[PDB]
Amino acid sequence: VFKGHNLPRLRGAMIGPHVTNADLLEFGNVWKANHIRWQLIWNGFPHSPADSATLDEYRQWLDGALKRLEAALPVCREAGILVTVDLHTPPGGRNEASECRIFHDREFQKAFIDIWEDIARRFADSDVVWGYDLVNAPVEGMVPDGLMNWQRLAEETARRVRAIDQKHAIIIEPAPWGSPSSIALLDPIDVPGVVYSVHMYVPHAFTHQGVYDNPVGIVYPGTIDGKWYDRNTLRKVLEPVRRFQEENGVHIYIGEFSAIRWAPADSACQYLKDCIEIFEEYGWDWAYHAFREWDGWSVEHGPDRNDRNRTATPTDRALLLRSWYAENVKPQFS
Secondary structure (H helix, E strand, O other): OOOOOOOOOOEEEEEOOOOOHHHHHHHHHOOOOOEEEEEEOOOOOOOOHHHOOOHHHHHHHHHHHHHHHHHHHHHHHHHOOEEEEEEOOOOOOEOOOOOEHHHOOHHHHHHHHHHHHHHHHHHOOOOOEEEEEOOOOOOOOOOOOOOOOHHHHHHHHHHHHHHHOOOOEEEEOOOOOOOHHHHHHOOOOOOOOEEEEEEEOOOHHHHOOOOOOOOOOOOOOEEEOOEEEOHHHHHHHHHHHHHHHHHHOOOEEEEEEOOOOOOOOOHHHHHHHHHHHHHHHHOOEEEEEEEOOOHHHOOOEOOOOOOOOEOOOOOHHHHHHHHHHOOOOOOOOO
């Protein structure tokens, strides 16, 4: 089974676009993470200035984002970290329904392929880059005649990247949203060195409680959306992903998973523990969402939605992540 790295497991986190060199060195050398997902994100997700920007404005933004990623790679090497390059905001962004314009517009669809050829050329020889996550949480909506849907665009883009780059994993999330259930909708891509990826936030009423218009006070384990949720329910959520893994003989990467920090009592920590245990049973690489990004997802911030101060002492959730990072092997660079 192709993984694209020679370690037992990648365990790390999403970082924020403003992550400092000191943050990276601390995360690798002190927290013992061996992995980050580097999001090429224009301000926010799922809504961004990309949604209304011209292709020229978008290419200018992305060139700045790639310059910082390039500058960060030698720091990741020093920190013992392998990197996922995540195109988090694609050219044209998304319409009001969060559907990606790369599925709707000939110029944006062509730009997606041209951009990935440029990124593959830039990083083809990097021993720090692990994989190319072609688009974050793809959502198609209506695909006009003459344009590729995600199945076809993924395959074409992966083929063009593989022509340039003979080493790195190509990471493909299913549409819609990179959700576990969506993997059943994706056919394996006929390109070598492909890794498949989903994000784990199910159930959203729990993991995103007190975000958007979602009520707070949702306990885990417990009854959520009229259904019993515990580790067995999360196994059932992830069953289509385990099936895809086993039936296709492919590797799985969890690009994001989290539970909001202000979930009641130890609910968020239990959710993360249950997720990680399942990922570990199945041999899945994983990135926690997120290290030093929005504080709702921060293990350095506390249980109170109204308190945005870092905690004085380590949280349950931070101790859990570091206990798993302590199992990591660091990459050997030459």
